[PDB]
C-alpha cells in the first residue's frame, strides 16, 4: 500500500480515525495495551494495540476529503479493514449544540465535488452504518454521556469567504468538519462500516471558544464511546 | 391553507403520510377510532381520528417531491404539525433488501433540483429525526418485525432512460421512492420531526415482482411500527 | 399500465389534462356525452366520453413534473395517445397578463432537473406542437376569446424562498405553473402532440386575487377552446 | 454605439439579421430601394433601404451567441429597434426536415452558458414573438411556400466532439444554428420582438449536401417571407 | 475548408489572429511584403505575405469563442497551421495594468461553457505555449517595450448584467477579452502552439477611456512583438 | 495562527512547500544553515534556516486542496509570507514528459469545487507568478537542468474510478498532483507570489515506475532550482 508502510495483519478490523497523527499517538499510548507503530510514512502515524484483549488500530487521516480518502481507500483495499470510526471534532453551528455534546453523524452535507464527479446530477447523501451508530449511542446512554444524533457539514475550505453555514444551521445541521462525507462514501462503496463521532471545538457562528478542560473531557468521552461501541 | 380545507385544530400533531389518498382513507378507517375527514380538496383526502386514545391524522401527499412539498409545507406552516411520518413503499435496488423488510431511511439521495436550487454548490444531505427513527426501530425489534436502517433514493422520474440506480446500489442505497428528500428537508427547515418508513413494492434491478399477500403483511407492519413508534 | 386501470381502447387519441382529478370529473360530466370512468387508481380519475360525436378523454395528472410525467408516460406508451392537452391554470407574473386571458404556452422554463439529468450542459427548450397551438389560437380568435401566446415557468416548489420569477417576468415569461415542461418534453420525445392551455388563478407578484366568477368564466373558455381546437 | 457607426434615425424599426455581412450587402442591394450603408465598422455591414415604401434595415451579426448579442444589444439599446428577424440557415438534424423547408423557430435549445450565467438552476426557454411568427407563417401559407414550425439548437461549437444532436433529434429538434437563443433572449429582455427564419444548408446527421440551386430558391423564399411578414 | 476559401499552401505556418477582418487587412498591408489575400468568404479576410523573407499569414477571427473556434479549427485541421497568435486588445480590470502595457496571457478564465461541455466537473485551465510566450517576452524586453505576464478573462457577453470581473480583478486577472480560452484550448488539443498578445482598449472598472494616439502606439508594439517573437 | 505554532518573525518571506512534513525536515536539514523548527503542531513540521546568508522557510502542507489551503492561508494572513513555492512531485500523464524532467506549472486544471464555489459559472484558471516562473526557468537553463513548462491537474481523489486524465493528456496537460490549484488561487487572491515546481514520481498512463536513484536526482534538482530561483 502506497501511503501506509505496514504488513499483512499489522492492522486491525477496527481502526479509529483521528485527523491529527499526534492525537493518533496520544490515543494509542493512553488507551491501548502492548502498542505497536506500523506506519511512519509521511508522519501520518498508525498504531495497533489492544483494548480489553481485542485488537484496535488508530490511524491519522490528515485534514480534508482528499487526504482522508487516501487512507480510507488503502485501509479498505490493502488491509481488508471492516469497521472505520472517525474520532475528531467540529465547529458547532447551532446554539443548541452544547460544548459537552458528543455528535454522532447520521449523514453529511458537503461542498466537496467528490460525489458530483461520480454522480453528476444526483445529490448523493452519505450514510453512517447504523449498527455502529446504535452501538455508540447505547454506549453513551448507558454511561449517561450527553449525545446528539444528526447531520454535519464536510467543508473543503477552513477559511471560507462564501460560507453557507448560516443557511445550513437553519436546516438543522449541527457542525462543520472536513472528513465525514469521504469516510461514509468510501466505506459504503466497499461494503464496509463507518461512523464519525465528534466533539465541539468551538461555536463558529456565536463566535465563542471552549476551554482546554472542556475539550479534554469530551475528547475522553469520544474515545470511550468509540471503544465501548465495539467491545 | 390553499390545498387543505380544514379548520384550526382539525389536524393532529402527528400526521402519517401515504402517497395514495385512497390508502389514506383505508389506513384511517382500518386503524383509527371516531374517524373524521377534514380535507376533500383535489381528492387528496386527509383524516383525523384516534389510536389508543391519542389523536393521529393521515394525509395523502401525491407522488413527487413537488406534490409532497405542498402538503408538508401547509401542514407545518398552517397547522403547526410537529411529527411527520411517510408511510409508503419503494422499489428495492439491492438483493439483500428482502421483500418482508421494513425500511427506515436515515437519509435520502436525489436527482431533484430542489436542494441545488437553495444551496448551489452544496450537496445537502437530508436527515431523518433520530428520536422518531429510534422509536420506530425499537417498536419493530420488540415485536421482531424485520427492519433495515439505511438510505434511499428520491427520484423525479418513475420511468428513467438515464437511471443511475445501478451505481446507487453499489454504494449501499436500499431502494428508490419519490418523496423522502422533500419531507426530510422541509421538516428540518421548520424545526419539525420527520421519518420515512417504507416497504418493498418490487425489486427493480433483479426484475421480480412481490405478491399481493406479501404486500398486505408488510404494509400492515409499516402502519403498526408507525403507530407504536409514537404511543 | 401501472397507474391507470384501463383496457385497450378505453382511452381516446385526445386526452385533456387537468391537474385536479375532481376537475377531471367535473369537466367530463359537464361537457361530454355518454361518459365513462376508466380509472379509479389512486383517486386520479380518468374518463372517456363524447363531444360532437368524437371521442375525448380527461385524465387528472396531479401536481408537479414528477406526477404528470407518470401519467403522460403511461398514456403515450400503454394507450398510444396522440394529442395531449393540459388544461389548468397558473399564477401570472406580469401586469399585462389580464385575469381574463387565456394562455397558450409556446414553451416553458423550469427549475426541474429533469432535462439537465438527460442533457447535462444543454438547456433543453420544450416546444408546444404548433398545429395544436394554431388550432387553439384560431378557435379563440373566431369566438373573440382573449388569448395570449408566450412562455411560462414550470416550477418544482409552490412555496419558494429562492423564487426567481421577478427576473423571469423581466424576460417576458407570463406565469408560473408546475406541469408544462414535463408534458412538452415527454410528448415530443415520443413523436406525439402536446399543448398547455392556461388561465390566471392570481397575480403572484402584484399580490391580488381573482374572484370566483372570473375563474368560472375563463375556466369555461379554456375547455371551450380546447374542445373546438380539435373538432 | 461601440460596434455600429451610425447616426440617430439611420436604422429602421425592423432589421433583418443575416450572419454573413456579405449576405447583408446582397440582400439589401437585391431587395431594397434607395439603399444606404450606415455601418462599415469591422466589415459587419449594415444597410437601410425601402421595401414597398416602408423602411427596413439589414445588419450582419457574425457567428455565435457572443457576436450576435453585441449587435442585438446595440440595435436595441442605442437605436430603439422594435422588430428583429434573423434570416440565416441551419444544419437539419431530422430526416423529415426537407431541404426546401423554411423553419420558423418557436424556441431554441443551447449549450451556450449565457442563460445559465444569468439564471443558475433555471433552464430558460427563449421564446419567439408570436405576432411575428404568425405573420411569417401566414405569408408562407398564402403563397404556398413550404414551412415548418418547431425548435432548433443554438450551438457554441461548429466542430463538436461532444455533439448531442442525436439525442436532440429524438426530441423533435429540427436543426442546429448558432444565433437564435441569443436573439430571442435579448429581445424579450428588452420588451422587443424577435424571430428566426431558417433554411436548410445540409442534413448533418444523414450526411448529404444540398445543391447551390436549392439554396438560392429557399434563401429567396426566406427573404420573401420575412418581408411580407411585415408589410 | 468550409469558412476559408484558400488552397493547399496559400496559408503559412504562423498566422496572426486579429478579431477585426479590417485590422487583418491593415496589418498585412502595413507590415508585410508581396501581400496576397486568400480568403474573402464572409468578409473575414485572410492574407499571406512576407516579413524579413519569412512567410506569415493574418486571418480575422470574429468576436467570441464560437467564431474564433471556427477559424482556429479550420486553420489547424485543413491548413496544418503550427503557430497561432492572437493579436487584439482587451478591457483592463486592474488599476496596475497601464494603458501602454502589452499583455501576454499565460492562461484564461471564462464563462464560456465550451470546456464544461467537454469536461463536466473539471475546470480546464487553458495554457499558452511557453516557447512562444518566452519569445514574445524576450522580444519586448530587448526593445524595452513595457510588458505584463498574467491571466485574462474570456467573456461571452460584452454587455453583462451579471459581470463578475470585480471578483476576477481581486484574484489578479488582468483584463477581459473574448477569444483566448478558445484559441488556447483548441491549439493544445491539436498539439499546436498558441499565444494571445493584448493591448488595453480601456479600463473597464475605473471607467476611463484611452486616446487614439495611445492605441496606435501600443497596437504597433503588439504587432512588432508578435513578428520579432518569431523571426 | 491556528495550525502553525510560531511567533512573529519566525517565518521567512520565502517558504518552500513540500507535501510530506518529513521531506520538510529532510530538505531543511540537508540544504540550510542554522536550522530552526518553529512548528510541531499536528506533525506538519515547518523550519526556518539560511541559504547563502538569506532566510528561507520550509513548511509541510499535507495532501489535497483542503490541507494546503489551510497552511497557505495562515502563512499569508498571519505571517505576511510573500513568495510561496511548492516543491513536490506528480504522476506524469504524457509520454513526452520524461522521468528526469522538472515541471514548472503555468497553471492548473482541477476537479476541486473550491473555485466553482466562489465563482459559479466561471472556470477560474489559476496563474503562476511569472517572475518566479522565469527565475526558476533561468536557474534551470543556466545549469542545463531539463525543464518543461506547461499545465497540470490538481485532483481531489488519488484513487479515481472516474478519472478523466486520458482526455487531459490529449489537451497537453503534463501530470496530476493535488495542491497547485489551491496554492495559485489563494496566493493571487492575496496579492502574493506562488509557483509549483514538480518532479515525475511515475507515468500513470503508461503504467511504469521510476527508480529510487532517478527520484533522488530530480528531487535534488528541484530544490536546487527552487533555491537559485530566488537568491
Ligand atoms: N471547517 C471547519 N473544520 C473544523 C472546525 N473545527 C474543527 Br476541530 N475542524 C476539524 O479540524 C480540522 C481542521 O482544523 C478538520 O479536519 C475539521 O475536521 C471548524 O470550526 N471548521
Ligand atoms: N421511482 C420509483 N418509485 C416507486 C417505485 N415503487 C414505488 Br411503491 N414507488 C413509489 O410509488 C410512487 C410512484 O409509484 C412514488 O411515490 C414512489 O414513492 C419504484 O419501483 N420506483
Ligand atoms: N407555482 C405555482 N403554481 C400554480 C400557481 N397557481 C396555480 Br393554479 N398553480 C398550478 O396549480 C398547481 C398547484 O396549485 C400546480 O399544478 C400549478 O400548475 C401559482 O400561483 N404558483
Ligand atoms: N452548428 C452548425 N451551424 C450551422 C450549420 N449550418 C449552418 Br448555415 N450553420 C450556421 O452558419 C453559421 C456557421 O456556419 C452559424 O451562424 C450557424 O447559424 C451547421 O450544419 N451546424
Ligand atoms: N468583454 C470585453 N471585450 C473587449 C473589451 N475591449 C475589447 Br478591445 N474587447 C475585445 O474586442 C471584441 C469586442 O469589442 C472582443 O473580441 C474582445 O476580445 C472589453 O472592454 N470587454
Ligand atoms: N493524483 C495523484 N497525485 C500524485 C501522484 N503522484 C504524486 Br507524488 N502525487 C502527489 O503526492 C500526493 C499524494 O501521493 C499528492 O500531494 C500529489 O501532489 C499521482 O500519480 N496521482
PDB file of N, CA and C and ligand atoms in Angstrom, chain D residues 2-3 42 70, chain E residues 19 62-64 86 88-92 153 155 157-159 176-179 198-199 201-202 204, ligand 5:
ATOM      1  N   UNK D   2     -20.874  51.418 -29.776  1.00  0.00           N
ATOM      2  CA  UNK D   2     -19.482  50.982 -29.971  1.00  0.00           C
ATOM      3  C   UNK D   2     -19.185  50.246 -31.292  1.00  0.00           C
ATOM      4  N   UNK D   3     -20.094  49.380 -31.749  1.00  0.00           N
ATOM      5  CA  UNK D   3     -19.782  48.430 -32.835  1.00  0.00           C
ATOM      6  C   UNK D   3     -20.436  48.795 -34.157  1.00  0.00           C
ATOM      7  N   UNK D  42     -15.658  47.149 -38.663  1.00  0.00           N
ATOM      8  CA  UNK D  42     -15.341  45.739 -38.574  1.00  0.00           C
ATOM      9  C   UNK D  42     -15.803  44.912 -39.774  1.00  0.00           C
ATOM     10  N   UNK D  70     -23.824  41.164 -29.188  1.00  0.00           N
ATOM     11  CA  UNK D  70     -23.311  42.508 -29.369  1.00  0.00           C
ATOM     12  C   UNK D  70     -24.230  43.370 -30.245  1.00  0.00           C
TER      13      UNK D  70
ATOM     14  N   UNK E  19      -9.158  40.219 -34.306  1.00  0.00           N
ATOM     15  CA  UNK E  19     -10.584  39.909 -34.315  1.00  0.00           C
ATOM     16  C   UNK E  19     -11.324  40.531 -35.503  1.00  0.00           C
ATOM     17  N   UNK E  62     -13.322  37.166 -36.003  1.00  0.00           N
ATOM     18  CA  UNK E  62     -14.625  37.494 -35.462  1.00  0.00           C
ATOM     19  C   UNK E  62     -14.477  37.623 -33.947  1.00  0.00           C
ATOM     20  N   UNK E  63     -15.598  37.940 -33.303  1.00  0.00           N
ATOM     21  CA  UNK E  63     -15.681  38.141 -31.877  1.00  0.00           C
ATOM     22  C   UNK E  63     -16.458  36.983 -31.233  1.00  0.00           C
ATOM     23  N   UNK E  64     -15.874  36.411 -30.174  1.00  0.00           N
ATOM     24  CA  UNK E  64     -16.495  35.355 -29.408  1.00  0.00           C
ATOM     25  C   UNK E  64     -15.802  34.022 -29.551  1.00  0.00           C
ATOM     26  N   UNK E  86      -2.839  35.393 -31.316  1.00  0.00           N
ATOM     27  CA  UNK E  86      -3.921  36.339 -31.256  1.00  0.00           C
ATOM     28  C   UNK E  86      -3.259  37.651 -30.957  1.00  0.00           C
ATOM     29  N   UNK E  88      -4.933  41.136 -30.383  1.00  0.00           N
ATOM     30  CA  UNK E  88      -6.071  42.014 -30.242  1.00  0.00           C
ATOM     31  C   UNK E  88      -5.914  42.813 -28.966  1.00  0.00           C
ATOM     32  N   UNK E  89      -7.022  43.328 -28.479  1.00  0.00           N
ATOM     33  CA  UNK E  89      -6.963  44.025 -27.218  1.00  0.00           C
ATOM     34  C   UNK E  89      -8.018  43.577 -26.210  1.00  0.00           C
ATOM     35  N   UNK E  90      -8.077  44.301 -25.104  1.00  0.00           N
ATOM     36  CA  UNK E  90      -8.911  43.897 -24.005  1.00  0.00           C
ATOM     37  C   UNK E  90      -9.218  45.076 -23.088  1.00  0.00           C
ATOM     38  N   UNK E  91     -10.264  44.931 -22.283  1.00  0.00           N
ATOM     39  CA  UNK E  91     -10.590  45.906 -21.278  1.00  0.00           C
ATOM     40  C   UNK E  91      -9.783  45.516 -20.068  1.00  0.00           C
ATOM     41  N   UNK E  92      -9.093  46.482 -19.475  1.00  0.00           N
ATOM     42  CA  UNK E  92      -8.283  46.212 -18.314  1.00  0.00           C
ATOM     43  C   UNK E  92      -9.188  46.340 -17.110  1.00  0.00           C
ATOM     44  N   UNK E 153      -9.618  37.165 -18.840  1.00  0.00           N
ATOM     45  CA  UNK E 153     -10.918  36.574 -18.809  1.00  0.00           C
ATOM     46  C   UNK E 153     -11.605  36.604 -20.171  1.00  0.00           C
ATOM     47  N   UNK E 155     -14.741  36.372 -21.883  1.00  0.00           N
ATOM     48  CA  UNK E 155     -16.189  36.538 -21.644  1.00  0.00           C
ATOM     49  C   UNK E 155     -17.023  36.155 -22.869  1.00  0.00           C
ATOM     50  N   UNK E 157     -20.422  37.513 -22.976  1.00  0.00           N
ATOM     51  CA  UNK E 157     -21.271  38.657 -23.128  1.00  0.00           C
ATOM     52  C   UNK E 157     -20.456  39.951 -22.967  1.00  0.00           C
ATOM     53  N   UNK E 158     -20.387  40.759 -24.031  1.00  0.00           N
ATOM     54  CA  UNK E 158     -19.803  42.110 -23.972  1.00  0.00           C
ATOM     55  C   UNK E 158     -20.526  42.987 -22.949  1.00  0.00           C
ATOM     56  N   UNK E 159     -21.855  43.017 -23.062  1.00  0.00           N
ATOM     57  CA  UNK E 159     -22.719  43.751 -22.152  1.00  0.00           C
ATOM     58  C   UNK E 159     -23.282  42.741 -21.151  1.00  0.00           C
ATOM     59  N   UNK E 176     -10.344  41.696 -19.664  1.00  0.00           N
ATOM     60  CA  UNK E 176     -11.327  40.841 -20.282  1.00  0.00           C
ATOM     61  C   UNK E 176     -11.332  41.027 -21.795  1.00  0.00           C
ATOM     62  N   UNK E 177     -11.232  39.909 -22.510  1.00  0.00           N
ATOM     63  CA  UNK E 177     -11.467  39.840 -23.931  1.00  0.00           C
ATOM     64  C   UNK E 177     -12.465  38.704 -24.180  1.00  0.00           C
ATOM     65  N   UNK E 178     -12.460  38.163 -25.400  1.00  0.00           N
ATOM     66  CA  UNK E 178     -13.497  37.220 -25.809  1.00  0.00           C
ATOM     67  C   UNK E 178     -13.047  36.090 -26.711  1.00  0.00           C
ATOM     68  N   UNK E 179     -11.738  35.807 -26.760  1.00  0.00           N
ATOM     69  CA  UNK E 179     -11.215  34.814 -27.681  1.00  0.00           C
ATOM     70  C   UNK E 179     -10.237  33.851 -27.085  1.00  0.00           C
ATOM     71  N   UNK E 198      -2.042  41.073 -26.045  1.00  0.00           N
ATOM     72  CA  UNK E 198      -3.114  42.057 -25.941  1.00  0.00           C
ATOM     73  C   UNK E 198      -2.739  43.456 -25.477  1.00  0.00           C
ATOM     74  N   UNK E 199      -3.424  44.438 -26.053  1.00  0.00           N
ATOM     75  CA  UNK E 199      -3.302  45.824 -25.619  1.00  0.00           C
ATOM     76  C   UNK E 199      -4.562  46.246 -24.832  1.00  0.00           C
ATOM     77  N   UNK E 201      -7.604  48.439 -24.455  1.00  0.00           N
ATOM     78  CA  UNK E 201      -8.547  49.368 -25.087  1.00  0.00           C
ATOM     79  C   UNK E 201      -9.143  50.418 -24.107  1.00  0.00           C
ATOM     80  N   UNK E 202      -9.327  50.032 -22.848  1.00  0.00           N
ATOM     81  CA  UNK E 202      -9.817  50.923 -21.816  1.00  0.00           C
ATOM     82  C   UNK E 202      -9.710  50.254 -20.459  1.00  0.00           C
ATOM     83  N   UNK E 204     -12.008  49.211 -17.601  1.00  0.00           N
ATOM     84  CA  UNK E 204     -13.435  48.934 -17.597  1.00  0.00           C
ATOM     85  C   UNK E 204     -14.032  49.281 -16.247  1.00  0.00           C
TER      86      UNK E 204
HETATM   87  N1  LIG G   5     -15.695  41.791 -22.934  1.00  0.00           N
HETATM   88  C1  LIG G   5     -14.910  42.761 -23.409  1.00  0.00           C
HETATM   89  N2  LIG G   5     -14.266  42.556 -24.572  1.00  0.00           N
HETATM   90  C2  LIG G   5     -13.451  43.511 -25.092  1.00  0.00           C
HETATM   91  C3  LIG G   5     -13.302  44.709 -24.372  1.00  0.00           C
HETATM   92  N3  LIG G   5     -12.470  45.547 -25.018  1.00  0.00           N
HETATM   93  C4  LIG G   5     -12.156  44.826 -26.087  1.00  0.00           C
HETATM   94 BR1  LIG G   5     -10.958  45.568 -27.463  1.00  0.00          BR
HETATM   95  N4  LIG G   5     -12.693  43.619 -26.208  1.00  0.00           N
HETATM   96  C5  LIG G   5     -12.386  42.725 -27.358  1.00  0.00           C
HETATM   97  O1  LIG G   5     -12.988  43.263 -28.519  1.00  0.00           O
HETATM   98  C6  LIG G   5     -14.015  42.418 -29.005  1.00  0.00           C
HETATM   99  C7  LIG G   5     -15.370  43.070 -28.722  1.00  0.00           C
HETATM  100  O2  LIG G   5     -15.235  44.503 -28.734  1.00  0.00           O
HETATM  101  C8  LIG G   5     -13.808  41.105 -28.311  1.00  0.00           C
HETATM  102  O3  LIG G   5     -13.100  40.284 -29.194  1.00  0.00           O
HETATM  103  C9  LIG G   5     -12.841  41.307 -27.199  1.00  0.00           C
HETATM  104  O4  LIG G   5     -11.739  40.444 -27.436  1.00  0.00           O
HETATM  105  C10 LIG G   5     -13.964  44.897 -23.189  1.00  0.00           C
HETATM  106  O5  LIG G   5     -13.767  46.099 -22.572  1.00  0.00           O
HETATM  107  N5  LIG G   5     -14.772  43.910 -22.712  1.00  0.00           N
END
